[PDB]
CSV table of C-alpha atoms (C1' of nucleotides) in Angstrom, one decimal:
chain,number,residue,atom,x,y,z
A,1,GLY,CA,79.1,190.5,31.1
A,2,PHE,CA,78.0,188.1,33.9
A,3,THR,CA,74.2,188.3,33.7
A,4,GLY,CA,73.7,189.3,30.0
A,5,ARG,CA,71.0,191.7,31.1
A,6,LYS,CA,71.0,195.2,29.6
A,7,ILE,CA,72.5,197.9,31.9
A,8,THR,CA,69.7,200.3,32.9
A,9,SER,CA,71.9,203.3,32.4
A,10,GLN,CA,73.8,204.1,29.2
A,11,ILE,CA,77.5,204.0,29.6
A,12,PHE,CA,79.7,206.7,28.0
A,13,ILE,CA,82.0,204.9,25.5
A,14,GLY,CA,84.9,205.9,23.3
A,15,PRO,CA,88.7,205.7,22.7
A,16,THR,CA,91.0,207.8,24.7
A,17,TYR,CA,94.8,208.1,25.4
A,18,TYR,CA,96.1,206.5,28.6
A,19,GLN,CA,99.7,206.1,29.7
A,20,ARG,CA,101.7,203.6,31.7
A,21,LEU,CA,103.7,205.0,34.6
A,22,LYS,CA,107.2,204.2,35.9
A,23,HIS,CA,105.9,203.2,39.3
A,24,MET,CA,105.6,199.4,39.2
A,25,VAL,CA,103.8,197.1,41.5
A,26,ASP,CA,106.7,194.7,41.4
A,27,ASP,CA,109.3,197.4,42.1
A,28,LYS,CA,107.3,198.8,45.1
A,29,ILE,CA,106.5,195.5,46.9
A,30,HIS,CA,108.6,194.7,49.9
A,31,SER,CA,108.7,192.3,52.8
A,32,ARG,CA,111.2,192.0,55.7
A,33,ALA,CA,111.8,189.2,58.3
A,34,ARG,CA,114.9,189.5,60.5
A,35,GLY,CA,117.2,189.9,57.5
A,36,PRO,CA,120.3,192.1,57.2
A,37,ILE,CA,121.1,194.4,60.1
A,38,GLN,CA,122.8,197.7,60.3
A,39,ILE,CA,126.4,197.7,61.7
A,40,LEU,CA,126.0,200.9,63.8
A,41,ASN,CA,122.4,200.8,65.0
A,42,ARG,CA,122.1,197.0,65.3
A,43,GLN,CA,118.7,197.7,63.6
A,44,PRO,CA,117.0,197.0,60.3
A,45,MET,CA,118.6,198.8,57.4
A,46,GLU,CA,117.4,201.6,55.0
A,47,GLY,CA,114.9,200.2,52.5
A,48,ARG,CA,114.1,197.3,50.0
B,1,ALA,CA,127.9,216.3,90.5
B,2,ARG,CA,130.8,218.5,91.5
B,3,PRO,CA,132.3,221.7,89.9
B,4,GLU,CA,135.7,219.8,89.7
B,5,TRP,CA,133.8,217.0,87.9
B,6,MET,CA,131.9,219.6,85.8
B,7,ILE,CA,135.1,221.0,84.3
B,8,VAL,CA,136.8,218.3,82.2
B,9,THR,CA,140.3,217.0,82.8
B,10,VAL,CA,140.1,213.5,81.4
B,11,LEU,CA,138.3,212.8,78.2
B,12,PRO,CA,136.3,209.5,77.9
B,13,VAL,CA,137.2,207.4,74.8
B,14,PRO,CA,134.1,205.7,73.5
B,15,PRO,CA,134.4,202.0,72.4
B,16,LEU,CA,134.4,200.9,68.8
B,17,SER,CA,130.7,200.1,69.1
B,18,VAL,CA,130.1,203.9,69.3
B,19,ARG,CA,132.7,204.5,66.5
B,20,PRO,CA,132.5,201.6,64.0
B,21,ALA,CA,135.1,201.1,61.3
B,22,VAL,CA,134.4,199.1,58.1
B,23,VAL,CA,136.7,197.8,55.3
B,24,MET,CA,135.6,198.4,51.7
B,25,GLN,CA,133.9,195.1,50.8
B,26,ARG,CA,139.9,200.0,56.6
B,27,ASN,CA,137.9,203.3,56.6
B,28,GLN,CA,137.8,204.9,60.0
B,29,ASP,CA,134.9,206.8,61.5
B,30,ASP,CA,135.3,210.6,61.7
B,31,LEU,CA,134.9,210.6,65.5
B,32,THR,CA,137.9,208.2,65.6
B,33,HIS,CA,139.9,210.6,63.4
B,34,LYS,CA,138.9,213.5,65.7
B,35,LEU,CA,139.8,211.8,68.9
B,36,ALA,CA,143.1,210.6,67.3
B,37,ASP,CA,143.8,214.3,66.6
B,38,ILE,CA,142.9,215.0,70.3
B,39,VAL,CA,145.5,212.4,71.5
B,40,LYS,CA,148.0,213.7,68.9
B,41,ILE,CA,147.8,217.3,70.2
B,42,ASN,CA,147.8,216.0,73.7
B,43,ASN,CA,151.1,214.1,73.0
B,44,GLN,CA,152.5,217.2,71.3
B,45,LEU,CA,151.7,219.4,74.3
B,46,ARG,CA,153.1,216.8,76.6
C,1,A,C1',125.9,178.3,55.8
C,2,C,C1',124.9,184.4,52.6
C,3,A,C1',126.9,189.4,50.5
C,4,C,C1',126.7,194.5,49.5
C,5,C,C1',130.9,200.9,53.8
C,6,C,C1',129.4,205.6,54.6
C,7,A,C1',128.2,210.6,53.7
C,8,G,C1',126.4,214.1,50.3
C,9,C,C1',123.2,215.5,46.5
C,10,C,C1',119.2,215.0,43.1
C,11,G,C1',114.9,213.3,41.1
C,12,C,C1',110.4,211.1,42.5
C,13,A,C1',106.1,208.7,44.8
C,14,A,C1',101.2,209.5,48.2
RNA sequence: ACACCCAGCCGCAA
């Protein structure tokens, strides 16, 4: 795609069935900076 | 440490930091309920 | 100047 030169090997091509999974990149990202604090432990709380 | 100290005759009551209580957005911690039962039975026996 | 209490259970991620 970049060079335009022929790829020396021959790539195996064809349609196939893929699926999208529940596990999202947006749902799994998480960052914390001195936010909410647990009442008992006086520590950071349990998850995003 | 002494054997008289080792057997218990006065029970230490922990502060509310040990046994926090929170209102729903006043529920008591279960340790608070248990030590309340302790002092209730102590008063009954008294 | 924030607002949401906790136990239990279950499913699930690598």
